[PDB]
Amino acid sequence: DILNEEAKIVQALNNQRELTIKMHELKREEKDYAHSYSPLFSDPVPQGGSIGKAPGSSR
Amino acid sequence: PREAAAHWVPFEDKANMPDNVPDVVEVGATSAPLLSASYFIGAKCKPYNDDFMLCREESQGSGAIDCLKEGRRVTRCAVSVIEDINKSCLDEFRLHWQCLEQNNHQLSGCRKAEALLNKCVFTKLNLEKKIPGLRPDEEPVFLKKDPWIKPAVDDFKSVRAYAEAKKNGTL
């Protein structure tokens, strides 16, 4: 009756250990430009300076 | 793109085109004849000019060397327009750009000569002067009667030729 109630607590603590190791993995994982920077306007391509612009200026 | 300051010294280059690229003869018109016939260069050579700039857009960064074959043809077609306008309308083309070299090359001050030039070129060279991007319900500026912006002094040769075209019934 007491071995089962200790195995329950050990399972509940190993669950927290797995959760902690997971939530540590999750932060060091790299992340998208749409999640790290603003979601709308998801491309990093600037295309900036649009009045006196030259054709051939893109690459 | 930026302009030279702080003791620029000019330098030129004693050299030639390589053999790979053929000869192309140049435009010898200066700013008042170029500004005079700008709309007729643009009316005849629209698809050539647009293919040249579309070349320059398509192969980015290579630029100069990969677009030489159509930069050839835009220059040759503009030269065709300018000798075409010489041999038909030399005296009033000359009347127009001689008006234009006074008055700061403003097109606002040479209306009575450009009416004559537009009428000649439209009946003989069959090219029309148009301003695009102009929706209807909007009058084009070089057509309007009594504009707010008149020049300081109208040129004498063009008002004399304009009155004589009135009395001939030319215009």
How many residue pairs bridge chain A and chain B with CB atoms within 8 Å of each other?
Answer: 14
d(CA A55, CA B54): 8
* Nearest chain A CA: its distance from B149 CA (Å): 27
d(CA B103, CA A39): 54
Q: Which residues does chain A have within 8 Å of residue B57's beta carbon, measured at their own beta carbons?
A: 55-56, 58
d(CA A4, CA A31): 42
Of B1, B53, B60, the CB nearest to A58: B60
The CA-atom distances, in angstroms, between B85 and each of B38, B80, B138 are: 12, 9, 29
How many domains, in total, are found in chain B? 1
* Nearest chain B CA: its distance from A53 CA (Å): 10
d(CA A35, CA A16): 27
SS (H, E, C) A1-59: CCHHHHHHHHHHHHHHHHHHHHHHHHHHCCCCHHHHCCCCCCCCCCCCCCCCCCCCCCC
Q: Work out the burial of residue A40: count CB atoms within 10 Å of its CB; fewer than 13 is exposed, 13-18 middle, 19 or more buried.
A: exposed
Tokens coding B143: 């057509």
Quick one: CA dihedral B133, B110, B27, B44, positive or negative? positive
d(CA B32, CA B95): 11
**Residue of chain B minimizing CA distance to A53:** B1
d(CA B145, CA B151): 14
Tokens coding B104: 């700061």
**Residue of chain A minimizing CA distance to B57:** A56
Cβ–Cβ < 8 Å for B171, B115: yes
* Nearest chain A CA: its distance from B121 CA (Å): 32
d(CA B55, CA B114): 34
Q: Determine the structural domain holding residue B70 and report its residue range.
A: 1-171
d(CA B139, CA B127): 20
**Are B57 and A55 a contacting pair at CB < 8 A?**
yes
Resolution in A: 3.0
Solved with: cryo-EM
Backbone angles phi, psi at B64, to 5 degrees: -55, -65
